[PDB]
Write a protein that binds this ligand. Sequence first.
Ligand SMILES: [Mg+2]
Ligand SMILES: [Mg+2]
Ligand SMILES: [Mg+2]
Ligand SMILES: [Mg+2]
Ligand SMILES: [Mg+2]
Ligand SMILES: [Mg+2]
Ligand SMILES: [Mg+2]
Ligand SMILES: [Mg+2]
Ligand SMILES: [Mg+2]
Ligand SMILES: [Mg+2]
Ligand SMILES: [Mg+2]
Lengths: 95, 100, 190, 181, 97, 287, 107, 120, 140, 55
Amino acid sequence: LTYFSARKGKRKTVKAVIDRFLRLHCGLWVRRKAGYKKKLWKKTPARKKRLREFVFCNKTQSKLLDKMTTSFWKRRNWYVDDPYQKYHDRTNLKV
Amino acid sequence: RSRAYTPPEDLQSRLESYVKEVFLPSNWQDISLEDSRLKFNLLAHLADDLGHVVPNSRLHQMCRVRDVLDFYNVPIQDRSKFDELSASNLPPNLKITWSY
Amino acid sequence: NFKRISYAKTKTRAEVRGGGRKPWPQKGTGRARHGSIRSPLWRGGGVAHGPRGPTSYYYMLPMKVRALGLKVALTVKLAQDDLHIMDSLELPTGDPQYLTELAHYRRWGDSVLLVDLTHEEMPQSIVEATSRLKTFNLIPAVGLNVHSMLKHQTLVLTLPTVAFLEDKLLWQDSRYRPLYPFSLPYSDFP
Amino acid sequence: VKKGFRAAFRFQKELERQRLLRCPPPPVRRSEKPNWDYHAEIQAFGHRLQENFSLDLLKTAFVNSCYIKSEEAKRQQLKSNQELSEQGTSFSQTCLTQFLEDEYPDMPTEGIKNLVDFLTGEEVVCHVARNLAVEQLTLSEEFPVPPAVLQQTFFAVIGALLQSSGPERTALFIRDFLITQ
Amino acid sequence: IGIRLTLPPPKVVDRWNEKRAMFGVYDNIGILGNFEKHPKELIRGPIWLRGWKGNELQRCIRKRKMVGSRMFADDLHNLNKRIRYLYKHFNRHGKFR
Amino acid sequence: ARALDLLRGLPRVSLANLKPNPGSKKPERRPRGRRRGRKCGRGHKGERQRGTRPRLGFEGGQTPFYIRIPKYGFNEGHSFRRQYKPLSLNRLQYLIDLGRVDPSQPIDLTQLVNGRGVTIQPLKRDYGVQLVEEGADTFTAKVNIEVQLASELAIAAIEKNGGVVTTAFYDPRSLDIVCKPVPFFLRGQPIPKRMLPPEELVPYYTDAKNRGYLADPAKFPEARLELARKYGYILPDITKDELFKMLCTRKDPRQIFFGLAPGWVVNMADKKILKPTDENLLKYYTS
Amino acid sequence: TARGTPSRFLASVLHNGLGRYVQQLQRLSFSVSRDGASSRGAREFVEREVIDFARRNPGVVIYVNSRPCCVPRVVAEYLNGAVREESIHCKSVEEISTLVQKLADQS
Amino acid sequence: KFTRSRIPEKVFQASPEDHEKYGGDPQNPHKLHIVTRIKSTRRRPYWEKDIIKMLGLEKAHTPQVHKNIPSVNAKLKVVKHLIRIKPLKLPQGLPAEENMSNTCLKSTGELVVQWHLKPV
Amino acid sequence: LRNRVTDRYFRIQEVLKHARHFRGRKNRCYRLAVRTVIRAFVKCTKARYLKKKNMRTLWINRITAASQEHGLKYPALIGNLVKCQVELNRKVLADLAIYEPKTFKSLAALASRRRHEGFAAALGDGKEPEGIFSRVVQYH
Amino acid sequence: KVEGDIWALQKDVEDFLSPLLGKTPVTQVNEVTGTLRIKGYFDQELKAWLLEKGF
RNA sequence: GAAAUUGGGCGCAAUAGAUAUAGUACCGCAAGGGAAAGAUGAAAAAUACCAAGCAUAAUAUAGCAAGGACUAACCCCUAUACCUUCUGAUGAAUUAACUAGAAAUAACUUUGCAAGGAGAGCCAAAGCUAAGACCCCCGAAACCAGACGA
Ligand SMILES: [Mg+2]
Ligand SMILES: [Mg+2]
Ligand SMILES: [Mg+2]
Ligand SMILES: [Mg+2]
Ligand SMILES: [Mg+2]
Ligand SMILES: [Mg+2]
Ligand SMILES: [Mg+2]
Ligand SMILES: [Mg+2]
Ligand SMILES: [Mg+2]
Ligand SMILES: [Mg+2]
Ligand SMILES: [Mg+2]
């Protein structure tokens, strides 16, 4: 990525990352599964039910996605009728 | 004007005399110095007399008369270290010079 | 360090003069491969990681840490028995030697920081006496800092400066987080 | 010109050391160098050997007769040494012959005289008194202290220990410094 | 032998100079002069770094946009090449990423 | 304290005595010596010692993780979605108890900013405060709040205690003037008129069930009556008590500040208000 | 190394244990700055330990010179005329006491 | 492949000739082993290095006391080529708190609870 | 040069005081003197083990020579003095061999006497009285 | 904001929390700043406890 | 990668710093490249000791040149030069001087304040602010633009 831009001297986000992923404020990145709209005629319905799911990311995938975006994207977002808003704070962890 | 202090032997009666002259009951050693005029007159008389003044670093520490009494009977003795070493009864094989 | 700006700049290997073509070819000579006579190995070449430009070392501590540092300097000067409080800085005469004799008699120190409330209302006699002295310095109460409280052995306040410092430093305790800068108007601040 | 001061100071003192090794000065006596208190160091010479002296008498044991004469040569612009050294060398000769007659009864007395004239020779007594700080306390004319003078001061110190504390303690002194040679 | 033989002339330092005795004054002009000035308005220097701290690429970017139109011609050219180098260095070279 | 009493016996604090708090200053590690530099941290000569390891996310040639994955619009319209900072009723009872928000006055958004109870930032497109039902039980306050969104249970918790809720609307310009009003009256502009909601939100603010500021004052007792029946409290009438004249005051739409009017120019310096009397300006500002 | 250094045979000074034992240390010469941060532990050594030390062996004559030094030194002189000059630079009082007793104990 | 070696049980069954050779009794055996590492664990498998670390035998030629129980004997059967085992025999009793400090384990294998330094 | 190095004569001279006795340019030039001075210090520490070793074989040569003067061999002498609980070591036996050859002759007589009691004891096998010098002093 | 003797406060907090743990809680006084730092969340218990004490 | 909107020196000090004592000497047909270096003193109307290199002072059986030693320099014994690249050939006569790790997102450590922090903007389900602490040197063939050249 760009660590220091030529105009501002700031970090830049990779906009592929924003266009594909969802940062929950606890640090978990949500994605869609690859191939969830491809060749559905040859996929068993258990597999089609698996592909239509919102799948969390790895630890290193998560830290890789944190480094590829900036602090605007890491921010509390108090939307109106957000569907994912009950998934932001992390309930009841014992680390 | 030299910072040596040697506390007097009649200091109980002098200090008590000043406490009466700023005022007076028995148990006069437990009189609170919460009034600020009373403290200024008492310590101003003692500083005028004894030549030894309560410093700023200690001035809030005396809240009773007994604390001023406990202040004015520490010997603050002030001289150079050449005069402290050479007066500390050196053995005959210590020789101390001060190239100053 | 916040006011500090280093004017040290050197020339890199691109800014130093000349050195645009290879000095000798790549292979045929038995000398070392070089690409310019201005690379950082050459007598006359650029500096590889030297100082670059004016650099400013600016940082602000939070204003509560600066204000607490002024407090801590005041309690330390009072606890070491170096605070002295006057009622006004009005001298009976304007000579310097009176003031050095006074500071020598009361066993103050080598160097005295006199602090009055404003720069306009400093009395003429202390201005004429301390404007000549190297170690006895008049400062307004706005000018009070921590480097020059520690640089000076004694510090001399007047009672209006003491009420000033209590007002300006007990304000930082029990004040809200700012909505906007305090130079702007507020309900109760000036 | 590299800026700075500490390498120039260290280099300045190493140059001073090579100046002292290339051309060393002639050795000055110790009383003409700093850190000398003569009286304190006579008392230290007393307590060093583990005995007591009458300090004035030991002081005259270190004062030669050449020193008074060149001193009065310096006045024009003190008891001597010789009585104590006479008593000390008379005593140490007879007590060394006591020890060496007792522990070697079969020796000829020519051999006891050559042993005793070894243990009071200039080589032995001058080797002993340069390691007991006698030479540093000798008031002599010239430096280094010439060996006949220092022999005289050493037996003056024996005479002063004799008049101080009797014949038995000097017998232990002579035993512990002259016989162990 | 790159070491000097005579020790240098002495460094007379006047600690009670005008500048040293009055160093640090008006660092607290904000917090006890009713916040009318900021202390960053006390520092004097280049106009592009009065009250600003950055690394070198940011000092060069800010120098170019704040004073670069009236810079000299080959100084402006050297500075554009420095931003072009320091760009290609910070963004493509290093150990941590 | 024993500690200043220690400072009596110690030498004076100078610029030669100071030392950082141990733990503050890690030492700089720099590549000289047997351990910090021979290879100097980079390892053996490859591409990571030369300095030229490729960009973040390059997996060496296979298609990267962050590109094997379908683009889905999680963040599709993110910067035009509206945000509303929560204000719980536990928070607002907390502000009322500590004197920070006066409940004997109307509680507009300016009064929650000046008591610093709620920080909203109009850039990063917060459109205001939403009331939050947290702390509805143990909320004991008669209050008059103007909050841009409100859940039904938070309206019920206020209106049980003798309160009045209304939901106003603010433009980002208007909300920005509302939050920090004093840096607007140093801007020299006349007070603007706040705009009506967009088409998404007109059906919100014209409904009496969620207490819209554009709704009827003839349909409100039906909705207050309905929540009082739903959540089981007998609806007190605001008309009886003495704060009623306070609990009725609303600023109309197209009014940003409370006692002021659009088009006025507040002169903060000599404490005046310049008011326009030209008819074209009065047609424009009272529209 | 041993081939670069000179060597010697183990000896005494004047058969130092045979008849009696003689303390081989004549003079110590401390030089201590009055104002100076390197001779702090020397200062607290003269104030605390040098009188006790000077009483524990009276055949040693001790000179505390107390000039403006920038490095403080101790200069031990021995009965056979050797001089060991060691520094007490930036040392604690306990480290100076073990050094001075080290110089006392040796020859 | 070089693998871990099980050892069959007939290897660990004494014969009365061995009771005549060594000094053992099959009825009423000894309680405590003395184990001593006498052959390095280097150039040995990592499991034997571990068993030497568990038994407390990282120093060579230093005795260690163990129990004569089948678990400790199982670990000792893993590393029986690196160690030496003797029975801890005790001529007098086990040491009470009076004789706790004045013991000495002799080289015979016995642990004497009064260790004077005087000849008999 | 902001801060270039002033104090470099002394780093060189810390190495070169160890090389003042070498040959060739190793006593002079720092690049050569460092390799030889390091290499001399490595030898200087590995030679502690060889000092101990070579003293011990020197002592075995001296004990071997002096015990061959009395007919014994070295293994006979050392073995049968261990067997007498004479726990002298090699340093002491070599120094007695040089400086006190009567004590060494009597130790050779004690070791050959014990050697013959070992022969006659391990010849007439069975229960017999032990030799006189064959007895051991039990320590408990 | 602990002003005074922090070691009495460490004794009394450590006597208060050890029935809620079994063991003594592992703490750290910072006598310079005047803080006291306990391991594990005990915020509501110490706020209630310090309201009982009168602070 | 926008916009609305907002509002003298903790420099160098003669291999450094300018290439600069000079765009000179020199090199090139030309465009163009491009040096090096000075040190007395108040007065010249007062004429030390230290790099490598040698010399004073050539050499003596045997061997990475040393180490253990030793009465003794050598003789005795021990000892497969250093860097770098490989699992285990490269470069260096030698001295002096010059010559290569630059970024504070997140985490950590230390303070301040704390449901708030921050000297507007920003973050906040114990956070925020401040600081400390992490990211090298040299080296092609080339490509392009504009000149100078028969
Ligand atoms: Mg170029
Ligand atoms: Mg190139
Ligand atoms: Mg240059
Ligand atoms: Mg703009
Ligand atoms: Mg130059
Ligand atoms: Mg040049
Ligand atoms: Mg030379
Ligand atoms: Mg050989
Ligand atoms: Mg070659
Ligand atoms: Mg070099
Ligand atoms: Mg032609």
